[PDB]
A paper describes a structure:
Synaptic vesicle glycoprotein 2a (SV2A), a putative membrane transporter in the synaptic vesicles (SVs), has been identified as a target of LEV and BRV. SV2A also serves as a receptor for botulinum neurotoxin (BoNT), which is the most toxic protein and has paradoxically emerged as a potent reagent for therapeutic and cosmetic applications. SV2 family proteins belong to the major facilitator superfamily (MFS) with 12 predicted transmembrane helices. In addition to the transmembrane domain (TMD) core, a cytosolic N-terminal region and a large fourth luminal domain (LD4) are present.
Purified HCA2 was mixed with purified SV2A to form a complex, and then LEV was added. We used cryo-EM single-particle reconstruction to determine the structure of the SV2A–HCA2–LEV complex. We successfully reconstructed a cryo-EM map of the SV2A–HCA2–LEV complex with a nominal resolution of 2.88 Å. The quality of the cryo-EM map is sufficient for modeling the SV2A and HCA2, except that the peripheral region of the HCA2 shows poor density. An unambiguous density, assigned as LEV, was observed at the base of the central cavity. Substrate-binding sites are typically located at the base of the central cavity of MFS transporters. Therefore, LEV is likely to occupy the binding pocket of an unidentified SV2A substrate. A narrow pathway is formed from bound LEV to the extracellular space, indicating that SV2A adopts an outward-open conformation (intravesicular-facing conformation). The γ-lactam ring of LEV creates a π–π stacking interaction with Trp300 on TM5 and Trp666 on TM10. The carboxyl and amide groups of the butanamide moiety in LEV form hydrogen bonds with the Asp670 side chain.
Residue numbers in the entry:
A (entry chain B): 876 to 1295
B (entry chain A): 137 to 403, 418 to 742
The structure:
């Protein structure tokens, strides 16, 4: 049911579908080292991806429903130059007729234009004043459905954001060639990322789109704050989803010193461009592989690893005393040789028992494979102290709302632009 | 019917005078004088507390405007409610009973407010304390008067106004001796902090407790017993007075000759009792506005209202204007530096009262600097770095920040007025109030000194009024003092320096006190013994309401002109004096 499916291969891009669409790529198109299947497009002329379909699959009907899907990453807009700068990213428009996706300040737009130059637009809007954003500089699954008889709809990560009737529109033509380049951007240093572009000749429903989202989500592999692959031997800042205005911090070194959530988080401001909350506050959490036999640096689910703590540019280890008072017992950072037999083994957990994708959670386990439990925070005398507990596991067993068993990894990225 | 009641009341008044003349003046009267003086010193103290603690409480409880102004005028709304309520209740329950209950309420809620952390809670506590201390002046004057013979009533009642002065002197001295020690940071509970102004509040509560202690050892006034049909214990109280007096004199052998006393003939449960009390008090109130007392009561309303309005207006106005003049001098001394360009260099310094304009600082780091009333205008900071910065009354208006970092600074978002920040980060912001809270330092000593001088100015008038009240008369003294107050009000313009305001404050305070004395004596003397506390307390409540209105009005006009306060004060006092000359003469009469 798929007509175009651009997928990475050995130093090239191919089409999974049985149509053999011609592909040509510019000399300035980049690829991520770890996840090469993601494509980076900079604001230049040579940064071009041309893919040409066949004449038998060119959209030239008037009752033909069709859908598209892709993953997109849009960095932060830093200055006023990006305001009111609607710039195109994908065109299938010839003779002023076709379909086009474009980006504006906090906006992603689908545009259809028939032979009569009638323009229909669907928009997705995300703010930039928020403390922590779910869309800025983070991967987004965008899919668009077009039913010529009822409506055209937008789905962001499988949920409905906007719909507009298109019954008024007449015959819509399409270009034989389809476009990947930043067109109409005044900003000389604005780039995007795009991957997993798929086209279907029918209107997809909620169920199929949710299935596609889950399939392409890579639920079996851990993801960071920016939606990329989690890697070992790299410093990550730490965020608690339920209490995101505090950061991991230390006070004293060793067992007698406790790691806690200190706040509040600071701010980055640009006077009516963005007023986000600082994400580079606190102490880094490096991940060290222990028993994962995989050669690659990618962290997978159920992996058993170790976690370094960077305090005054010195690397310590997570451990807690297994034998102490209560289940919500205090974790600590220790000098790397003096761990002894303290519980240090941590299991990475991304998807649940049923396989439904959720955020990163770490489960402290001992040498004997006994679950100390999920890592989180609990309040002791008004201090949010870090503790590993099986209480989270108990609520998971009871299908209750766990409180604090979810962590988020934030590496330093160029798309955020914060000053360390 | 009415004639019979009038005859009975007159007979009781005449015989009561006779019994008091027999008992005589001596130790009993002086003992009661000291006790009731403490009760009045408490009310003297209570009117200074919030004004002395507001400079510290504004920082300690994050007090905005429309909150400082209210806390100021709260001791007066509470006194307004309390005066009426306890004055009305004192004629059905007794003077000493109601005095104990009101003083106890005052003491409790002052103690509570000493520890309260919030603002609304502090408002409520300080309102109830005002309610409690509201009923002090009416009960006290009406209570002491019922033990004095007509020979020297004005002289002996006027001495009772020394104590209110003493209360203010106490307040000022304790504020001077306690508040200046800002270091005291007693810690009991991490979330709470105990400063020196709270200690001041506690020590201000003390006088009221001492008042209750003293009062418990005095007897209810015999007159109240006689009106309410209770004959035996009125007899016993009069016997006690006679016994104490004569034993102190040196003749502990003579006998109380009075055997029978004329007494006014008397003609769900909780709710019924409350309704009955309310009905009786309402009756006493309206009987105060009866045919026999309607002219007197309206002249009394006029005199009380006009005097309170003028006095409170000017009393709040003089410190206001002194602060205004200080401000003007400070603003005159301000230094200006228009334009300066700075390259890589470290800046530590402390600047006070400065304006830097058109600055251009490029990659400058600001470590460990204190700003007091320093404004940066039309400046450009680029790759700057602010660390360990504490600022009072500091603003950045029309400034542009580029790639600057504010680390460990209390530069909140209200100190950047119409600024433009680009790629700027705020890290580890210091704890402070969301809005400007201003700052008061070394200038509190002079505030305490000024208060002290106000009270001391009051002293000569008290002495002279007490000595001449019976020789001259209440109407003459009231008039002669209100007129001089009006003249003093006219002389206000011949003052624009701080020293001038201090001298003028002293003059006005020294002049108005005799008028206030005379109006206290007159108001006691002019009402029957079954309505004295009710009437006195309704007039005192009116006094407090006038205080609220005059404080508001006269503080509204500070720094605007010196014509509005002079005109308002002079007009009010002239009308007060005019109305006072139309009141009936009460000297050389039995207390009826
Ligand atoms: C605001 O900052 C961004 C990111 O730059 C980072 O953050 C700054 C506060 C400062 O610490 C820089 O050294 C950091 O690199 C700027 O956007 C980037 O600018 C750099 C130039 O150094 C350029 O190489 C990147 O391509 C830019 N990225 C994008 C997506 O444009 C931005 O220029 C700053 N804002 C303004 C108004 O200049
Ligand atoms: C602070 O620095 C200034 C110059 O920036 C210097 O004159 C001064 O001596 C310093 N103070 C101390 C205590 O060193
Ligand atoms: C500062 O403010 C004035 C108006 O308030 C404006 O004209 C001026 O351009 C500003 N300063 C600079 C250097 O831009
Ligand atoms: C106790 C005295 C009291 C009064 N009612 O006379 N005073 C004196 C100055 C202002 C005031 O209310």
């Amino acid at each position: 049911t798929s007509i175009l499916s651009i997928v990475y291969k050995k130093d090239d891009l191919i089409d999974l579908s049985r149509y053999g669409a011609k592909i040509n790529i510019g000399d300035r198109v980049y690829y991520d080292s770890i996840d090469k299947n993601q494509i980076k497009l900079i604001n230049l002329e040579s940064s071009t991806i041309e893919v040409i379909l066949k004449n038998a699959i060119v959209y030239n009907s008037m009752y033909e429903n069709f859908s598209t899907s892709f993953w997109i990453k849009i960095p932060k807009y830093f200055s006023k130059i990006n305001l009111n700068n609607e710039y195109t990213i994908i065109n299938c428009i010839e003779n002023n007729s076709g379909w086009k996706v474009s980006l504006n300040y906090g906006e992603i737009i689908w545009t259809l234009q028939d032979n009569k130059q009638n323009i229909q637009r669907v928009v997705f809007k995300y703010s930039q004043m928020v403390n922590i954003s779910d869309y800025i500089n983070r991967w987004i699954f965008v899919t668009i459905t077009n039913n010529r008889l009822t409506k055209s709809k937008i789905y962001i990560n499988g949920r409905l954001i906007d719909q507009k009737p298109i019954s008024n529109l007449g015959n819509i033509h399409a270009s034989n060639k389809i476009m990947f380049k930043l067109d109409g951007c005044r900003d000389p240093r604005r780039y995007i990322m795009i991957k997993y572009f798929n086209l279907f000749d029918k209107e997809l429903n909620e169920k199929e789109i949710k299935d596609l989202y889950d399939s392409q989500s890579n639920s079996g592999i851990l993801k960071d704050f920016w939606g990329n692959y989690l890697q070992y031997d790299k410093p990550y800042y730490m965020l608690n989803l339920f209490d995101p205005n505090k950061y991991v911090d230390v006070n004293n070194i060793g067992i007698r010193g406790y790691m806690y959530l200190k706040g509040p988080r600071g701010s980055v401001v640009t006077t009516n461009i963005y007023l986000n909350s600082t994400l580079y506050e606190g102490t880094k959490f490096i991940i060290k592989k222990y028993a994962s036999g995989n050669e690659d640096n990618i962290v997978r689910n159920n992996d058993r690893v170790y976690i370094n703590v960077v305090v005054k540019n010195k690397e310590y280890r997570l451990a807690t005393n297994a034998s102490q008072a209560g289940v919500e017992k205090i974790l600590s950072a220790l000098e790397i040789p003096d761990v002894g037999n303290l519980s240090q083994v941590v299991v990475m957990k991304s998807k649940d028992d049923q396989g439904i994708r959720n955020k990163c959670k770490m489960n402290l386990q001992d040498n004997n494979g006994n679950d100390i439990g999920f890592i989180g925070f609990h309040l002791y005398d008004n201090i949010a102290k870090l503790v590993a507990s099986n209480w989270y596991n108990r609520q998971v067993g009871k299908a209750s709302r766990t409180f604090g068993c979810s962590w988020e990894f934030i590496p330093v990225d160029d798309g955020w632009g914060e000053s360390s | 019917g009415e004639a019979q009641r009038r005859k009975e009341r007159e007979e009781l008044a005449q015989q009561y005078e006779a019994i008091l003349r027999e008992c005589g003046h001596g130790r009993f009267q002086w003992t009661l004088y000291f006790v009731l003086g403490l009760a009045l010193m408490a009310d003297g103290v209570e009117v200074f507390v919030v004004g002395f603690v507001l400079p510290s409480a504004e920082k300690d409880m994050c007090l905005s405007d429309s909150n400082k102004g209210m806390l100021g005028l709260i001791v007066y709304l509470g006194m307004m409610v309390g005066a009426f309520l306890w004055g009305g209740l004192a004629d059905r329950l007794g003077r000493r009973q109601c005095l104990l209950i009101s003083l106890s309420v005052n003491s409790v809620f002052a103690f509570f407010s000493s520890f309260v952390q919030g603002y609304g809670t502090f408002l409520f506590c300080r309102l109830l304390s005002g309610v409690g201390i509201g009923g002090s002046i009416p009960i006290v004057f009406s209570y002491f008067s019922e033990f004095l013979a007509q020979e020297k009533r004005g002289e002996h009642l006027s001495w009772l106004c020394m104590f209110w002065m003493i209360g203010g002197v106490y307040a000022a001295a304790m504020a001077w001796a306690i508040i200046p020690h800002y270091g005291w940071s007693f810690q009991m509970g991490s979330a709470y902090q105990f400063h020196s102004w709270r200690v001041f509040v506690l020590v201000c509560a003390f006088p009221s407790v001492f008042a209750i202690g003293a009062l418990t050892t005095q007897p209810e006034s015999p007159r109240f017993f006689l009106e309410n049909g209770k004959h035996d214990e009125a007899w016993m109280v009069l016997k006690q007075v006679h016994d104490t007096n004569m034993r102190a004199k040196g003749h502990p052998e003579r006998v109380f000759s009075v055997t029978h006393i004329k007494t006014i003939h008397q003609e769900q449960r909780w709710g019924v009792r409350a309704l009955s009390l309310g009905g009786q008090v309402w009756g006493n109130f309206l009987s105060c506005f009866g045919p026999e007392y309607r002219r007197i009561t309206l002249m009394m309303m006029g005199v009380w209202f006009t005097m309170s309005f003028s006095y409170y207006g000017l009393t709040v106005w003089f410190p206001d204007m002194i602060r205004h003049l200080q401000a003007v001098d400070y603003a005159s001394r301000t230094k200006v530096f228009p334009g300066e360009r700075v390259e890589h260099v470290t800046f530590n310094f402390t600047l006070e009262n400065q304006i830097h304009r058109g600055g251009q600082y490029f990659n400058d780091k600001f470590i460990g600097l204190r700003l007091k009333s320093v404004s940066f205008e039309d400046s450009l900071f680029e790759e700057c770095y602010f660390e360990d910065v504490t600022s009072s009354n500091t603003f950045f208006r029309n400034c542009t920040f580029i790639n600057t970092v504010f680390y460990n600074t209390d530069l909140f978002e209200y100190k950047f007025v119409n600024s433009r920040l680009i790629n700027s980060t705020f890290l580890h912001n210091k704890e402070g109030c969301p809005l400007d809270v201003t700052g008061t330092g070394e200038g509190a000593y002079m505030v305490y000194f000024v208060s002290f001088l106000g009270t001391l100015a009051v002293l000569p008038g008290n002495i002279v009024s007490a000595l001449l009240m019976d020789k001259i008369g209440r109407l003459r003294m009231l008039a002669g003092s209100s007129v001089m107050s009006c003249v003093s009000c006219f002389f206000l313009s011949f003052g624009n320096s701080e020293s001038a305001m201090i001298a003028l404050l002293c003059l006005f305070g020294g002049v108005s006190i005799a008028s206030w004395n005379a109006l206290d004596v007159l108001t006691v003397e002019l009402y029957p013994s079954d309505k004295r506390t009710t009437a006195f307390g309704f007039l005192n409540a009116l006094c407090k309401l006038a205080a609220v209105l005059g404080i508001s009005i006269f503080t509204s006009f500070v720094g605007i002109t010196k014509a509005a306060p002079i005109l308002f004060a002079s007009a009010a006092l002239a009308l007060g004096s005019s109305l006072a000359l139309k009141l009936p003469e009460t000297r050389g009469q039995v207390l009826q």
